Amino acid sequence: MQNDAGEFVDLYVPRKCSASNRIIGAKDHASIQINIAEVDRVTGRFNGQFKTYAICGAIRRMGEADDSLLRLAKTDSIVAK
Amino acid sequence: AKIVKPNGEKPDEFESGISQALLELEMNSDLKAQLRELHITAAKEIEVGGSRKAIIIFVPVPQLKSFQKIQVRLVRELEKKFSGKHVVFIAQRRILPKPTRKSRTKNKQKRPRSRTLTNVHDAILEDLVFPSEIVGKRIRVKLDSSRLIKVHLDKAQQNNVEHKVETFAGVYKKLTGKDVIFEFPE
Amino acid sequence: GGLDVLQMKEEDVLKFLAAGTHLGGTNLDFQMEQYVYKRKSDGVYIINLKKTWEKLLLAARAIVAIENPADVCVISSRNTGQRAVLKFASATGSTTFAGRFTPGTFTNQIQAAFREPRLLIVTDPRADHQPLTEASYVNIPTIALCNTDSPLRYVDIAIPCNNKGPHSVGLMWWMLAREVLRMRGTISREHPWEVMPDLYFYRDPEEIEK
Amino acid sequence: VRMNVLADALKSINNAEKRGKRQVLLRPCSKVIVRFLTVMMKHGYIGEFEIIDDHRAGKIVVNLTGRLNKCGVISPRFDVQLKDLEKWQNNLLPSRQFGFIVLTTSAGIMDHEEARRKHTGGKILGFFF
Amino acid sequence: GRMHAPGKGLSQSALPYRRSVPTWLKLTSDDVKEQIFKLAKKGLTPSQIGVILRDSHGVAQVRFVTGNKILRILKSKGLAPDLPEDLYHLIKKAVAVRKHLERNRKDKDAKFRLILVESRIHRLARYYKTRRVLAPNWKYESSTASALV
Amino acid sequence: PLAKDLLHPTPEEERRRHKKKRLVQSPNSYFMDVKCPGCYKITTVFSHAQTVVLCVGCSTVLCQPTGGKARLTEGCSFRRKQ
RNA sequence: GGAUCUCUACUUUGAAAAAAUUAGAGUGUUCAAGGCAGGGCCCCCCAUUGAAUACCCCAGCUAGGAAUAAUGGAAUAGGACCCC
Numbered sequence: 001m002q003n004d005a006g007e008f009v010d011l012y013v014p015r016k017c018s019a020s021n022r023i024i025g026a027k028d029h030a031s032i033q034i035n036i037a038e039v040d041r042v043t044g045r046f047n048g049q050f051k052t053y054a055i056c057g058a059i060r061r062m063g064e065a066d067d068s069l070l071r072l073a074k075t076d077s078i079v080a081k
Numbered sequence: 082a083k084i085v086k087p088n089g090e091k092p093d094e095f096e097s098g099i100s101q102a103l104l105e106l107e108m109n110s111d112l113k114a115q116l117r118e119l120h121i122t123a124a125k126e127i128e129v130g131g132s133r134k135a136i137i138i139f140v141p142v143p144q145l146k147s148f149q150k151i152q153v154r155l156v157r158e159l160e161k162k163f164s165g166k167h168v169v170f171i172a173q174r175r176i177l178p179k180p181t182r183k184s185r186t187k188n189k190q191k192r193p194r195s196r197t198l199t200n201v202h203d204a205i206l207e208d209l210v211f212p213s214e215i216v217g218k219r220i221r222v223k224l225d226s227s228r229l230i231k232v233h234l235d236k237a238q239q240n241n242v243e244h245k246v247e248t249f250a251g252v253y254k255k256l257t258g259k260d261v262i263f264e265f266p267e
Numbered sequence: 268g269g270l271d272v273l274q275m276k277e278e279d280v281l282k283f284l285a286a287g288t289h290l291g292g293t294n295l296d297f298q299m300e301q302y303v304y305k306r307k308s309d310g311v312y313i314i315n316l317k318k319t320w321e322k323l324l325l326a327a328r329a330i331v332a333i334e335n336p337a338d339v340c341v342i343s344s345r346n347t348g349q350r351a352v353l354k355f356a357s358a359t360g361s362t363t364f365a366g367r368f369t370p371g372t373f374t375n376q377i378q379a380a381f382r383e384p385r386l387l388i389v390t391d392p393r394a395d396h397q398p399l400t401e402a403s404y405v406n407i408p409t410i411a412l413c414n415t416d417s418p419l420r421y422v423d424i425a426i427p428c429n430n431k432g433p434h435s436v437g438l439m440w441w442m443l444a445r446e447v448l449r450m451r452g453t454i455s456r457e458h459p460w461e462v463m464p465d466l467y468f469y470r471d472p473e474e475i476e477k
Numbered sequence: 478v479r480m481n482v483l484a485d486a487l488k489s490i491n492n493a494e495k496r497g498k499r500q501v502l503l504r505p506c507s508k509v510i511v512r513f514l515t516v517m518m519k520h521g522y523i524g525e526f527e528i529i530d531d532h533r534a535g536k537i538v539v540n541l542t543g544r545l546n547k548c549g550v551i552s553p554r555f556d557v558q559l560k561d562l563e564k565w566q567n568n569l570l571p572s573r574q575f576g577f578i579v580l581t582t583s584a585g586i587m588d589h590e591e592a593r594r595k596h597t598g599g600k601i602l603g604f605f606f
Numbered sequence: 607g608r609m610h611a612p613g614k615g616l617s618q619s620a621l622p623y624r625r626s627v628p629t630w631l632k633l634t635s636d637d638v639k640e641q642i643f644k645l646a647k648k649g650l651t652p653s654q655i656g657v658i659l660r661d662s663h664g665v666a667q668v669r670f671v672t673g674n675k676i677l678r679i680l681k682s683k684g685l686a687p688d689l690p691e692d693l694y695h696l697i698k699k700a701v702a703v704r705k706h707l708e709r710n711r712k713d714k715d716a717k718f719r720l721i722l723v724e725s726r727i728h729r730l731a732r733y734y735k736t737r738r739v740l741a742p743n744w745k746y747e748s749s750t751a752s753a754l755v
Numbered sequence: 756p757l758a759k760d761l762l763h764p765t766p767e768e769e770r771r772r773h774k775k776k777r778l779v780q781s782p783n784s785y786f787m788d789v790k791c792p793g794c795y796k797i798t799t800v801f802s803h804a805q806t807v808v809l810c811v812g813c814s815t816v817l818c819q820p821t822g823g824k825a826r827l828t829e830g831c832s833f834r835r836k837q
Numbered sequence: 838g839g840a841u842c843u844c845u846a847c848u849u850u851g852a853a854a855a856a857a858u859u860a861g862a863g864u865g866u867u868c869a870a871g872g873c874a875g876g877g878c879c880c881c882c883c884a885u886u887g888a889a890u891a892c893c894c895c896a897g898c899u900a901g902g903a904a905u906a907a908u909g910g911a912a913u914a915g916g917a918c919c920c921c
Contacts, residue, residue, distance in 0.1 A: 019757075020497040021543025032423055034386075035332040036325065039450060044272045046331045046450050048345045055423070059497060061403070063298050063418070064757040066425040069325075071758060078323040078328070080269040120916090179843060180910095183905070190917050191910050196840045214624060217779060220528035226515065233526075267766075415787075482840050499758040505839065509905080525916080527762055531779045532623055534840040538761045556847055572892055583848060583902040598848050620774040620782045628786075630836055635765030663807045682912090683789055721821070 017056040019068035030032060030057025034069070051076055082120045085141075092123070097140065099124040102162055110158070110222050115151055119144050122173045126166070129251035135167040137252060145172040149211055155210075167248045171208045171256070174201045202257045206232065210263075213238045217266070230261045239265050268324035272456065275320045279442070282464060286434040289314045291427070294416035302427035303415060312415045314427045323439075326388075326410045326424045328448040333385050336360030340384035340407070342368055342398045347433055348390040351440040351467040358462065361388075368398045372428050373405050386410070389429045412439050429433045437467035479505070486510045486537075487548040487603060490523075494545050495523050506535030509602070512586035514539060516579050517548065520588075546571075550603035554581075557599045562589055569604045576606030610722045627670050632662065638671045642679055650694065651691040652676040690752070693734065696727045697755045704748065724748075763813045786834040800825070800833070 001010045015024045015033070024031045031054065038049040053072050055065050073079040083100035084092055089155070092100065100121065107116035117139075126136040140148045148155075152170050159168045175197040180189055194200055207215060210232070217233030242249075246263040254263050268274075288344060291312040293305060301320075321423035333339055339361035342450045343352040349365045356363040362384060364372070368440075371381055387402045388410045399409060399421040411417070413425040429435035441464040449456045479485065482505040493501035503510065506528060516524050516539070524540030557565060557580060566589060570576035577588040582599035592598065607614040633641075641663065645655045656676055659665035668676050680686040687694065690744045706747050707716050734740040764778065774783050784802040791810055800808050804818040804825035818825035827833060 004305070016473075022497075024483075030403045030421075031406060032408045032422060033406070034329055037272070037328040037332040037450070039270070039328070040271075041270060041342050042342055044270060044456065045452065048356065050328075050332045056404070059408060059757075061422060062497070062757075063420060064497070065423045067298070067301070067757060068275065070322075071422060073325055075467075076400065077269055090912070169872080176843080188917055192842070193911090194842065197557070198844070202844090214626060216624065218530040220530060222511070222518075222526055222528060224518065224525055226519075228528075478838070499756050502761050507840070508844095512904085529762075532621075532625060533780075537779070540792060558848075561863065581847095581905045583904055584802045585904055587904095596849070597902075600847070601906085614774075616775060618775070620780045622781055623779055628836070657806060661801040661804045662787075662798070664801075666786070679910090684913090753772055 015054045017059060017065070018053045018072060019055050019059050019069070022056045022058065024054060027031050028057045030060055031034065031055065032060055036069075037077075051078070082117070084122070084124075085120045095126060096124045099136065102159065106155075106158060108235070110152055111194045112154065115147075121145055127251065129248050132163060133167075133248075135169065135248045136163070136198055137171050138168060139173040140170055140174045142174060154264060166167050166246055167249070169209055169251070169252055170211065171172065171205055174204060176201050185250060200257070205256060206253060206261070209252055210242065212241050222225065227260075230259060231267050232261055234263055236265055236267050268321065268328075270377055271323050277446045278459070279346040280316055281319070281340065282438055283316050283319075285437045285475070286429075286464075287432055288319070288428050288435050288438060289316055290429050290432075290435075292294060292416035292431075295414060295428045298409035299413060299415050299417065299427060302425070313414065314429070319427050324423060325453060326426055327443060327450055329386060329408070329410065330359070330361075330388075330443075330447045337362055339388065340364065340382065340386065340447045342387045343390040344368060344398075344473065345391060346361065347431065347469050348436050350469055352390065354462075354467050355440045355444050358425055361449055364398070364419045366399075368395070370397060370401065371408065372400075373381075373401045383407075390436060392419065392422055396420075400462075412436065433469045438464050441446055453454075481550065481552060483508055483513065483553065483602060484550045486513075487550055487605075490539065490541070490545070490562045494541055494543075494548075497543075499541055501539050501541060503537040503539065506537050509581075509586065510537065513579055513602060516577070516586070516588050517545075520539060520577065522548075522600055546606050548603065551584050554600050556600055556603065557601045559592070559596065560594040562592065562598065563591075565601060570605050576604065578604050610726065616742045621667070625670060628664075628666070631664055631666075631671070631683055633671060636666060639664060642668070642676060642728050643667075643683060643685065646680050646685040651687075651694075652680065653691060672746065690734065690739065693727070694755065696723055696730060698753050699723050700727060700748075701752045701755055705752075785835045785837075787835050789827060789831050789833045791815050792815065792830040792832075799836075802835075 002009065003009050003053060014026070016022065017024060022026060033052060033054045035050045035052055037046050039045060040047050040052065053069060059065055059068060069078065083104045086092065086098065103116060107113045121138055121140050123139040124217065125139075126134055128134045147243050150169055156171075164166065173179075175196060176198050177192045178184070180186075180192060204250055213234040215232055216235055217230035219233070221229040221231055223229060243265075249263060250261050253259060279282045287306075289375050291314045291461045293310040293312070295303060295306075297305060302315055302318050304315045304460060306312050312334055334432075336359055337374060339355050339359070340363070341352040342364040343349055343362055344367065346462075352363050355361070362382060369378075369380055371378055375381065378447065383405065387396055387398065387407045388443060390412055392399060392411045392413055399411075402409060402412065403421050409421055410424040411419075411422045412428050412430045413419060414428070414430045417425075419425055426439065428439050428441075439471065442464065444462075445460050454460060484506065487508075488501045489503055490501050493569065511528065513522060513525040514526060520526070522545045524542050526537055526539040529538060551569075557603055562578075562580075565578055567579055568571070577590065579586065579588055579602045580592050580597070580599050581602055582597045584595050584597055586602065587595075614691060615677075638659070641659060642655055644665060644695075645658060646652075650658070652675075656665075656668055657666060672679065674682070700720060703716055703720045703723060707713065707720060710716065724746070731740060731744060731746060735744065737744060758777050761778075762830045762832060769777050774780055786799050786801060788797045789808075790797060791813070793815060794810060794813055796810065798808070798810060798817065800818055805820050806818075807816060808818040808825070809816050815831075816828055817831055818827050
């Protein structure tokens with residue numbers, strides 16, 4: 001949100017769920033922001049780069065948290081098809 | 082015969098040249114008795130993707146089904162006279178404008194569904210791929226208003242039209258102004 | 268792991284067949300139907316070992332992403348995975364709850380046994396439902412060795428395997444411990460790991476003395 | 478029986494959206510639905526959709542972007558003039574900053590903002606925000 | 607569901623997408639019309655004619671080999687019956703129920719069905735009068751209906 | 756099943772589901788060339804014959820009407836066409 | 838009250854309409870409720886001194902639009918155009 005003059009008036013921009021584009025509320029304790037490390041092409045060791053994914057509590061409680069991360073890993077070329 | 086136009090107009094060099102190839106073919110082939118009773122209305126050559134061109138031989142609607150029985154023979158024989166030119170046979174259907182409340186008329190005859198733009202454009206799409214057959218039809222409405230039609234042809238007869246899918250798109254875009262991509266599902 | 272060096276070799280698939288990691292019981296969860304290959308004639312569901320390897324490395328990537336290894340919690344309530352998670356915690360450097368998970372360990376701050384990890388790893392989602400449900404009140408992710416008849420109520424990385432069975436569960440904890448160490452600067456990935464998969468196998472008290 | 482097929486289309490979208498789905502299949506296809514889904518797509522609420530064309534009413538499969546809160550219809554389909562349009566905006570739209578009321582005017586099926594610029598009224602199909 | 611009974615069963619035909627005759631069907635439009643005329647003369651309703659052509663002659667759809675439906679083929683030649691087939695079978699059933707109802711007097715189930723059938727007869731005949739298929743003076747009489755079947 | 760591809764389903768699901776609930780409805784029936792063991796003429800017979808089909812100008816019976824598909828007589832070989 | 842064809846209800850404009858009232862423009866009755874008057878210069882003149890404008894359901898009238906919803910057109914054809 002802006003103030004029609006370039007002034008961002010939102011005190012904090014919440015994280016949207018990487019699986020359902022849902023706003024992760026400040027009191028959504030079941031929410032998860034899991035990091036998935038990236039490996040090297042030639043040796044496959046941890047270099048320091050990782051990928052961030054946020055899944056809200058509703059998707060996680062429903063049981064579609066592992067399928068969402070699986071599809072998100074295939075999109076970022078983490079796990080094989 | 083060779084060509085019988087509805088009005089008093091006369092064909093040009095190219096339409097007469099195609100008509101000459103039809104009467105010459107019937108004289109020295111087994112298509113003598115079949116090409117004497119049939120004729121064409123027009124024949125327009127258009128360009129396609131790249132440095133290639135194709136022709137569109139128009140046939141009257143009552144003579145369409147009789148033209149399909151010998152199209153598999155006419156296509157192979159006519160493509161020998163024009164090597165790098167594909168041939169198609171699409172009927173000449175008339176599209177009547179829908180009755181509005183401004184065009185002054187007296188006794189318009191209900192404008193049958195066969196003359197609608199939707200029925201004509203779908204009929205043209207069927208005659209354009211006559212060796213194959215439309216098994217399915219999708220409409221990929223993209224993010225903007227521009228859509229894309231996805232025609233699903235038969236798995237059989239694929240080795241005959243696998244190279245004409247580029248010409249079918251150019252012909253259908255020239256006559257109707259629509260984007261069509263052809264697929265062969267199983 | 269989609270590269271060429273992150274593909275399982277012949278010696279890895281032989282251990283899965285010897286332990287029984289592909290056998291997945293008679294029941295099937297609708298959330299695990301993508302990890303099962305085909306049901307047998309005796310009702311047993313065969314778990315795809317290739318998809319297990321992909322979820323294993325995906326699980327190992329999240330573990331290495333945790334800077335402090337102590338922030339990883341490895342909970343196993345059943346006796347079949349008690350000594351397996353203890354050797355896993357020592358091989359990596361993570362915490363563990365090998366006994367009975369006291370309710371309120373993650374929520375009751377004034378409690379003596381209070382531990383707030385960054386990544387929870389349970390053996391059986393059904394048998395360890397209390398640590399999973401309690402970890403939902405906090406922002407603690409979950410990596411679970413999920414069988415076919417295992418609910419994914421609070422599972423974030425479901426590892427399809429035969430969680431029940433001494434040789435099966437002990438191998439999975441040994442496989443994950445090796446991949447986590449291989450992704451670090453500890454194992455060369457060319458020489459086989461010195462630790463044998465029999466160190467993670469739970470032994471009944473009747474067979475220990477012999 | 479199946480009356481007001483536009484209601485069954487937007488109800489299917491609104492439900493599938495809250496379930497977290499990515500694609501929703503609409504059983505009956507209609508030009509009123511396509512004109513409604515195009516306005517929702519031009520403002521960035523739904524993605525692309527393939528009009529599956531069988532030799533019947535036809536089906537549609539719409540992609541969902543997770544940006545839609547609720548899409549519904551106005552069942553009686555009242556006649557909205559250019560003066561009474563402001564009253565419908567306050568009741569249906571959740572805010573004066575977003576949300577649209579899809580109308581049916583002589584210039585075509587469009588939202589309420591475009592009806593103000595073209596200076597024309599008509600009937601009300603529904604809303605989305 | 608049904609009109610006069612509960613039940614949401616969907617047991618109907620599923621016509622294919624391809625509106626074309628198969629290549630193995632060599633019967634032309636004239637051959638199919640000759641088969642219909644022979645079958646329509648011997649007292650076969652348009653429903654029964656299409657069944658024989660489908661199961662013995664391979665004619666999957668008479669509408670595809672020809673340009674008209676089975677009833678329009680008979681209506682053009684003049685072999686269509688006076689009253690439609692569906693309305694004829696509803697009256698045929700009502701006479702059979704009423705004949706059973708006058709012998710068995712205390713079968714309240716049959717008396718209940720007679721109201722259901724006669725309700726379908728009046729609404730089906732009402733549709734035919736709007737389409738000018740039946741004369742405006744047409745009326746189903748429970749006494750004189752037995753001579754029409 | 757949160758993100759399921761509804762446009763390109765596997766042929767195992769389209770073949771399994773009901774003929775009316777498919778993406779594009781298609782009949783589960785077909786036509787066959789029933790060959791009588793005695794004679795040699797080929798007769799196209801619908802799968803669910805629904806009628807007692809016999810050879811034209813003969814005596815042998817080809818099919819029997821049942822609840823679903825027709826029960827062909829013994830020895831009457833057939834082949835489906837497309 | 839299903840889908841489907843170029844992709845008289847509805848809608849917009851105009852005409853017409855008692856004022857008062859309501860909304861509202863101008864204006865220091867000492868302010869205000871109100872009024873429709875009154876302001877400026879040394880026998881007048883300037884501010885064409887002002888005394889606006891909006892609203893007036895529905896129905897009727899008029900001119901555009903043609904989406905949406907009804908409705909009609911050729912089937913026992915001499916149906917539409919010609920021929921003449």
